């Protein structure tokens, strides 16, 4: 499931459209995106 | 950041001995060099990785973006 | 006049010490051109197992993607070669990793806070905060249900500190392994320090007995010069205990009464280990790779 | 039977048809075999000249030259330079196994 | 290339006269013995064997006449046109070694016919090449036989009447 991160209270809340760009456990504005299980590959050099 | 795996010049694996100097001064209670001698301490082409390392990963981990407070 | 029969009658090996990591054995009357090449091959050309391609399905902690991808490749895996075989990069991705060319590893760790009371030991304070090397778990791919059953792929020093974590964070990866020369990258290196040192030889000229002999004792490593009295004045105990400091060559009293030299064919190999192989065995690999390199030119015809 | 003809190449822009003077361009090599091979060739007394030179360390090439007095070509001197270096790597090993077993 | 075109022309042509074969090889032996006076003691000067590229490709193309057209050269008795166990048997042991500088395949066909035909005995000298053995594009002309069989399944039906096969 796509969710995001509240930068302030550290509570992972998702975001649908026609919604406030806010937190909802605190009242914070700036909000950052988390990652999920996705394949990335690297050389060990 | 964390302790390097391999000695840069020589190449001995040095992710091994980072942890015995509190107990060298709390359990063994010595001064510096007596505690800097015994436990497998051998070459000042890689004895630096005791004295030289900073281990800045402790200062990052307090900035967790994933926990309350 | 040199013939290979005559090499055989004056070549000696003095294996002074032979441990499970750091072997130390002397040689006699071989040229430096051969003896460097044994040092040359033991660093580069003896192959070893190392992690090559790291697939992170999830990396969340503070140690970044590419840094921890680099550290896993450095991990010396206690698996003898001539179990895997080489990779061959003239064929695509889904054909490049088989059951025969690739030990397949994986690592899954999540950290969460343990209820504890405090000033608090950060092992007791968080579950799985240290990611040691002994959390890397071998996954048996293909026919590897009995052909690595006696020897599961264990990191040769299982106390390598791969990461530190905090609650919320996780690292979920899958790292393949491969067999490769050390001449490409410095993680395939099957030796800590492959080195030879050339044996010093100390020449005295005058009798230097008495009070002077005590200041010829102390200007060297202690197991080098032995005094009895003027009877047995100052004999060389060990020319191997001494390394070249030349402490005696800055004094006035011994400015000319002693000279220093090297025995120009008596090597002293030191061969440490990477933790995968015994050190005398990687010296056997080196002396046959050069023989593998000698026959292969002979088995090669000259076209133009 | 599949030859691998990349590894030897006799540069005919330096080789006379006397055979006593030639110039081999090895690939995939370095100082590792070169000094070790050249020391073996210089014990054959019919070899008047033998030296190696890596042209440039970036590419993995190797050039050795052998001149002889006659009555042995560079190729008949190259092979005995390789025929002995096989045996010289066995006199090391066979002397070495016999010293492990006495501990 | 033209001599290389000429050599695999004769032995890969069903419809010629049995004296049109001769005059080609009559001239092609005439040129190699017009060749004897001039450039058969110029060999040992300071130069290379690549001076004579024109020679060996001609003698290659002459050997490919004899390889798959030899019984036409057979006269009533079994003798040869201008004594080919004296013409070839000189140039087998000449001061060029043309046994070495022609193609390896067609010279292998030559001695493995001249053994079973008694014109030359050059299998010893091809064996006598042990230690001594602009080149890469000189192989590629000597292996270019222009009259190889057609792999395409449809036009050889026409050329099943004008052409000699590998048999």
Tab-separated table of C-alpha atoms in Angstrom, chain C:
chain	number	residue	atom	x	y	z
C	1	UNK	CA	76.062	-23.368	-15.938
C	2	UNK	CA	72.413	-23.864	-15.003
C	3	UNK	CA	70.301	-26.962	-15.546
C	4	UNK	CA	67.046	-27.867	-13.811
C	5	UNK	CA	68.738	-30.929	-12.316
C	6	UNK	CA	71.171	-28.538	-10.651
C	7	UNK	CA	68.301	-26.443	-9.311
C	8	UNK	CA	66.959	-29.521	-7.573
C	9	UNK	CA	70.145	-30.278	-5.672
C	10	UNK	CA	70.436	-26.893	-3.916
C	11	UNK	CA	66.848	-25.750	-3.508
C	12	UNK	CA	65.576	-26.032	0.045
C	13	UNK	CA	62.422	-25.062	1.906
C	14	UNK	CA	62.494	-24.296	5.619
C	15	UNK	CA	58.895	-24.221	6.827
C	16	UNK	CA	59.563	-22.509	10.123
C	17	UNK	CA	55.977	-21.940	11.205
C	18	UNK	CA	52.709	-22.993	9.622
C	19	UNK	CA	49.460	-21.852	11.206
C	20	UNK	CA	45.863	-21.922	9.982
C	21	UNK	CA	46.051	-18.242	8.983
C	22	UNK	CA	49.620	-16.935	8.749
C	23	UNK	CA	52.248	-19.296	7.327
C	24	UNK	CA	55.926	-18.386	7.343
C	25	UNK	CA	58.402	-20.511	5.430
C	26	UNK	CA	61.919	-19.935	4.159
C	27	UNK	CA	63.416	-20.608	0.726
C	28	UNK	CA	66.991	-21.193	-0.458
C	29	UNK	CA	68.811	-20.455	-3.746
C	30	UNK	CA	65.884	-19.523	-5.976
C	31	UNK	CA	66.092	-16.371	-8.056
C	32	UNK	CA	64.014	-13.296	-7.232
C	33	UNK	CA	62.218	-13.439	-10.583
C	34	UNK	CA	60.535	-16.677	-9.610
C	35	UNK	CA	59.981	-15.713	-5.985
C	36	UNK	CA	58.289	-12.427	-6.732
C	37	UNK	CA	55.975	-14.213	-9.137
C	38	UNK	CA	54.788	-16.412	-6.289
C	39	UNK	CA	53.988	-13.236	-4.375
C	40	UNK	CA	52.480	-11.822	-7.548
C	41	UNK	CA	50.042	-14.669	-8.151
C	42	UNK	CA	48.905	-15.098	-4.533
C	43	UNK	CA	47.462	-11.591	-4.485
C	44	UNK	CA	46.028	-11.402	-7.989
C	45	UNK	CA	45.593	-14.709	-9.737
C	46	UNK	CA	44.356	-17.166	-7.126
C	47	UNK	CA	40.558	-16.835	-7.395
C	48	UNK	CA	38.078	-16.628	-4.555
C	49	UNK	CA	34.386	-16.439	-3.737
C	50	UNK	CA	32.927	-12.985	-3.267
C	51	UNK	CA	29.556	-11.301	-3.396
C	52	UNK	CA	29.145	-9.489	-6.701
C	53	UNK	CA	25.563	-8.435	-7.492
C	54	UNK	CA	23.469	-7.109	-4.626
C	55	UNK	CA	19.713	-6.843	-5.073
C	56	UNK	CA	18.124	-4.689	-2.391
C	57	UNK	CA	14.432	-5.259	-2.197
C	58	UNK	CA	14.240	-2.814	0.685
C	59	UNK	CA	16.847	-0.589	2.333
C	60	UNK	CA	15.399	1.846	4.842
C	61	UNK	CA	18.096	2.592	7.429
C	62	UNK	CA	20.730	5.314	7.491
C	63	UNK	CA	23.531	3.369	5.783
C	64	UNK	CA	22.824	4.078	2.138
C	65	UNK	CA	22.178	1.769	-0.790
C	66	UNK	CA	25.563	1.846	-2.491
C	67	UNK	CA	27.701	1.843	0.664
C	68	UNK	CA	26.250	-1.310	2.152
C	69	UNK	CA	26.272	-2.822	-1.319
C	70	UNK	CA	30.029	-2.336	-1.233
C	71	UNK	CA	30.562	-3.853	2.206
C	72	UNK	CA	28.846	-7.170	1.507
C	73	UNK	CA	31.240	-7.805	-1.364
C	74	UNK	CA	34.119	-7.372	1.061
C	75	UNK	CA	32.872	-10.230	3.261
C	76	UNK	CA	35.298	-13.192	3.022
C	77	UNK	CA	33.211	-16.307	2.538
C	78	UNK	CA	34.616	-19.524	3.999
C	79	UNK	CA	33.997	-21.626	0.887
C	80	UNK	CA	36.768	-23.344	-1.026
C	81	UNK	CA	36.810	-22.805	-4.788
C	82	UNK	CA	36.764	-25.726	-7.204
C	83	UNK	CA	33.170	-25.975	-5.999
C	84	UNK	CA	31.759	-23.146	-8.065
C	85	UNK	CA	32.912	-22.361	-11.564
C	86	UNK	CA	33.371	-19.092	-13.407
C	87	UNK	CA	30.703	-16.832	-14.762
C	88	UNK	CA	30.643	-16.088	-18.482
C	89	UNK	CA	29.455	-12.600	-19.405
C	90	UNK	CA	28.775	-13.394	-23.082
C	91	UNK	CA	25.198	-14.459	-22.242
C	92	UNK	CA	22.282	-12.542	-20.707
C	93	UNK	CA	20.862	-12.120	-17.218
C	94	UNK	CA	18.540	-15.111	-16.849
C	95	UNK	CA	21.242	-17.488	-18.097
C	96	UNK	CA	24.137	-15.965	-16.181
C	97	UNK	CA	23.401	-17.345	-12.708
C	98	UNK	CA	23.086	-21.116	-12.448
C	99	UNK	CA	23.033	-23.658	-9.640
C	100	UNK	CA	26.745	-24.143	-10.305
C	101	UNK	CA	28.180	-20.615	-10.549
C	102	UNK	CA	26.409	-18.709	-7.788
C	103	UNK	CA	26.085	-19.052	-4.062
C	104	UNK	CA	22.906	-17.103	-3.322
C	105	UNK	CA	22.708	-15.156	-0.069
C	106	UNK	CA	19.967	-13.050	1.486
C	107	UNK	CA	19.598	-10.828	4.532
C	108	UNK	CA	16.365	-9.709	6.214
C	109	UNK	CA	16.421	-7.623	9.405
C	110	UNK	CA	13.849	-5.370	11.065
C	111	UNK	CA	14.503	-3.409	14.245
C	112	UNK	CA	11.838	-2.612	16.844
C	113	UNK	CA	12.129	-1.165	20.326
C	114	UNK	CA	12.330	-3.638	23.191
C	115	UNK	CA	10.600	-2.573	26.436
C	116	UNK	CA	13.493	-2.144	28.867
C	117	UNK	CA	14.315	0.214	31.631
C	118	UNK	CA	17.282	2.608	31.788
C	119	UNK	CA	22.154	5.352	30.079
C	120	UNK	CA	21.022	2.211	28.307
C	121	UNK	CA	22.991	-0.541	26.556
C	122	UNK	CA	21.921	-0.316	22.882
C	123	UNK	CA	21.808	-4.065	22.489
C	124	UNK	CA	19.346	-4.408	25.363
C	125	UNK	CA	17.519	-1.287	24.206
C	126	UNK	CA	16.616	-2.357	20.649
C	127	UNK	CA	16.021	-5.737	19.037
C	128	UNK	CA	18.519	-6.552	16.255
C	129	UNK	CA	20.230	-3.169	16.243
C	130	UNK	CA	23.557	-4.645	15.109
C	131	UNK	CA	23.540	-6.423	11.771
C	132	UNK	CA	26.462	-8.785	12.105
C	133	UNK	CA	27.877	-10.878	9.295
C	134	UNK	CA	26.488	-14.021	10.924
C	135	UNK	CA	22.979	-12.890	10.005
C	136	UNK	CA	23.749	-13.467	6.310
C	137	UNK	CA	21.866	-16.670	5.608
C	138	UNK	CA	22.746	-19.069	2.810
C	139	UNK	CA	19.834	-19.961	0.570
C	140	UNK	CA	20.227	-23.304	-1.222
C	141	UNK	CA	19.596	-22.847	-4.930
C	142	UNK	CA	19.334	-25.748	-7.330
C	143	UNK	CA	21.312	-28.830	-6.396
C	144	UNK	CA	22.701	-27.220	-3.253
C	145	UNK	CA	20.793	-29.376	-0.786
C	146	UNK	CA	23.677	-31.756	-0.165
C	147	UNK	CA	26.679	-30.257	-1.999
C	148	UNK	CA	26.932	-27.497	0.603
C	149	UNK	CA	25.352	-29.463	3.441
C	150	UNK	CA	28.611	-30.159	5.275
C	151	UNK	CA	29.867	-26.639	4.583
C	152	UNK	CA	27.122	-24.012	4.670
C	153	UNK	CA	28.412	-20.719	3.361
C	154	UNK	CA	29.642	-18.981	6.497
C	155	UNK	CA	31.433	-15.605	6.545
C	156	UNK	CA	34.978	-16.366	7.638
C	157	UNK	CA	34.835	-13.805	10.439
C	158	UNK	CA	31.149	-13.751	11.423
C	159	UNK	CA	31.523	-10.595	13.552
C	160	UNK	CA	31.763	-8.055	10.718
C	161	UNK	CA	29.571	-5.057	11.520
C	162	UNK	CA	27.528	-4.598	8.360
C	163	UNK	CA	25.028	-2.036	9.650
C	164	UNK	CA	23.418	-0.415	12.637
C	165	UNK	CA	19.668	0.117	12.772
C	166	UNK	CA	16.895	1.771	14.771
C	167	UNK	CA	13.202	0.868	15.219
C	168	UNK	CA	11.245	1.379	12.023
C	169	UNK	CA	14.212	0.714	9.801
C	170	UNK	CA	14.860	-2.407	7.756
C	171	UNK	CA	17.263	-3.869	5.204
C	172	UNK	CA	15.874	-6.579	2.941
C	173	UNK	CA	18.309	-7.781	0.304
C	174	UNK	CA	19.440	-10.639	-1.890
C	175	UNK	CA	23.119	-10.848	-2.809
C	176	UNK	CA	24.536	-13.266	-5.335
C	177	UNK	CA	28.080	-14.597	-5.169
C	178	UNK	CA	30.668	-15.420	-7.805
C	179	UNK	CA	34.187	-16.790	-8.303
C	180	UNK	CA	36.771	-14.377	-9.640
C	181	UNK	CA	40.368	-13.237	-9.893
C	182	UNK	CA	41.754	-10.736	-7.462
C	183	UNK	CA	43.312	-8.822	-10.331
C	184	UNK	CA	39.935	-7.266	-11.141
C	185	UNK	CA	38.714	-6.013	-7.783
C	186	UNK	CA	40.217	-6.070	-4.311
C	187	UNK	CA	37.489	-8.191	-2.745
C	188	UNK	CA	38.554	-11.415	-4.445
C	189	UNK	CA	41.984	-11.210	-2.773
C	190	UNK	CA	42.733	-14.611	-1.209
C	191	UNK	CA	45.462	-13.261	1.103
C	192	UNK	CA	45.819	-10.606	3.786
C	193	UNK	CA	49.512	-9.897	3.178
C	194	UNK	CA	51.411	-12.069	0.724
C	195	UNK	CA	54.980	-10.985	1.316
C	196	UNK	CA	58.536	-12.133	1.105
C	197	UNK	CA	61.390	-10.505	2.937
C	198	UNK	CA	64.979	-11.069	1.963
C	199	UNK	CA	67.186	-12.391	4.730
C	200	UNK	CA	69.668	-9.907	6.244
C	201	UNK	CA	73.304	-10.893	6.647
C	202	UNK	CA	75.543	-9.159	9.174
C	203	UNK	CA	79.319	-9.104	8.729
C	204	UNK	CA	81.633	-8.147	11.558
C	205	UNK	CA	85.283	-7.343	10.885
C	206	UNK	CA	87.080	-6.644	14.139
C	207	UNK	CA	86.694	-8.385	17.449
C	208	UNK	CA	84.233	-6.101	19.208
C	209	UNK	CA	84.112	-7.784	22.634
C	210	UNK	CA	83.808	-6.387	26.122
C	211	UNK	CA	81.929	-3.197	26.986
C	212	UNK	CA	81.537	-2.483	23.263
C	213	UNK	CA	79.798	-5.838	22.792
C	214	UNK	CA	77.057	-4.726	25.174
C	215	UNK	CA	76.452	-1.710	22.906
C	216	UNK	CA	76.338	-4.133	19.987
C	217	UNK	CA	73.765	-6.265	21.790
C	218	UNK	CA	71.334	-3.457	22.438
C	219	UNK	CA	71.492	-1.727	19.037
C	220	UNK	CA	69.596	-4.650	17.449
C	221	UNK	CA	66.585	-6.816	18.185
C	222	UNK	CA	67.448	-8.741	21.347
C	223	UNK	CA	67.512	-12.238	19.867
C	224	UNK	CA	70.280	-11.438	17.378
C	225	UNK	CA	73.600	-10.928	19.171
C	226	UNK	CA	74.876	-13.175	21.939
C	227	UNK	CA	77.667	-12.384	24.370
C	228	UNK	CA	79.533	-14.905	26.525
C	229	UNK	CA	82.748	-13.003	27.459
C	230	UNK	CA	85.759	-12.240	25.236
C	231	UNK	CA	85.577	-16.000	24.833
C	232	UNK	CA	82.663	-16.159	22.329
C	233	UNK	CA	82.517	-12.374	22.046
C	234	UNK	CA	79.431	-11.481	19.989
C	235	UNK	CA	78.033	-14.166	17.725
C	236	UNK	CA	75.020	-13.782	15.472
C	237	UNK	CA	72.228	-15.812	17.043
C	238	UNK	CA	69.535	-15.202	14.449
C	239	UNK	CA	69.765	-13.168	11.257
C	240	UNK	CA	65.986	-13.661	11.057
C	241	UNK	CA	65.156	-12.009	14.373
C	242	UNK	CA	66.748	-8.831	12.988
C	243	UNK	CA	64.922	-6.615	10.616
C	244	UNK	CA	66.736	-3.751	8.974
C	245	UNK	CA	66.715	-0.818	11.357
C	246	UNK	CA	70.438	0.012	10.996
C	247	UNK	CA	70.630	1.305	14.539
C	248	UNK	CA	74.261	0.176	14.637
C	249	UNK	CA	75.137	2.237	11.545
C	250	UNK	CA	74.746	5.626	13.215
C	251	UNK	CA	77.347	5.119	15.959
C	252	UNK	CA	81.006	6.070	15.988
C	253	UNK	CA	82.326	2.902	17.635
C	254	UNK	CA	80.630	0.636	15.106
C	255	UNK	CA	80.940	2.968	12.157
C	256	UNK	CA	83.200	0.492	10.394
C	257	UNK	CA	83.546	-2.601	12.596
C	258	UNK	CA	80.338	-4.137	11.199
C	259	UNK	CA	78.645	-4.174	7.804
C	260	UNK	CA	75.123	-5.121	6.760
C	261	UNK	CA	73.964	-7.110	3.756
C	262	UNK	CA	71.187	-9.265	2.354
C	263	UNK	CA	71.470	-12.923	1.397
C	264	UNK	CA	70.235	-12.388	-2.133
C	265	UNK	CA	68.460	-15.712	-2.621
C	266	UNK	CA	67.208	-16.691	0.840
C	267	UNK	CA	63.637	-15.487	0.898
C	268	UNK	CA	61.268	-15.483	3.845
C	269	UNK	CA	57.716	-15.771	2.632
C	270	UNK	CA	54.965	-14.716	4.960
C	271	UNK	CA	51.555	-15.823	3.713
C	272	UNK	CA	48.571	-14.760	5.791
C	273	UNK	CA	45.042	-15.926	4.950
C	274	UNK	CA	41.690	-14.467	4.034
C	275	UNK	CA	39.783	-16.951	6.172
C	276	UNK	CA	38.610	-19.085	3.270
C	277	UNK	CA	41.683	-21.262	2.748
C	278	UNK	CA	44.674	-22.559	4.622
C	279	UNK	CA	47.784	-20.517	3.810
C	280	UNK	CA	49.972	-23.401	2.670
C	281	UNK	CA	47.282	-24.427	0.187
C	282	UNK	CA	47.066	-21.054	-1.526
C	283	UNK	CA	50.809	-21.307	-2.002
C	284	UNK	CA	50.109	-24.612	-3.749
C	285	UNK	CA	47.562	-22.826	-5.931
C	286	UNK	CA	50.105	-20.194	-6.918
C	287	UNK	CA	52.853	-22.617	-7.956
C	288	UNK	CA	50.446	-24.445	-10.270
C	289	UNK	CA	48.757	-21.363	-11.746
C	290	UNK	CA	52.220	-20.431	-12.986
C	291	UNK	CA	52.457	-23.978	-14.300
C	292	UNK	CA	48.949	-23.524	-15.725
C	293	UNK	CA	50.315	-20.352	-17.292
C	294	UNK	CA	53.443	-22.116	-18.574
C	295	UNK	CA	51.778	-25.018	-20.359
C	296	UNK	CA	49.137	-22.828	-21.928
C	297	UNK	CA	51.641	-20.842	-23.950
C	298	UNK	CA	53.287	-24.099	-25.054
C	299	UNK	CA	49.817	-25.317	-26.040
C	300	UNK	CA	49.361	-22.331	-28.333
C	301	UNK	CA	50.533	-22.262	-31.968
C	302	UNK	CA	52.151	-19.258	-33.584
C	303	UNK	CA	49.957	-17.828	-36.345
C	304	UNK	CA	51.526	-14.686	-37.882
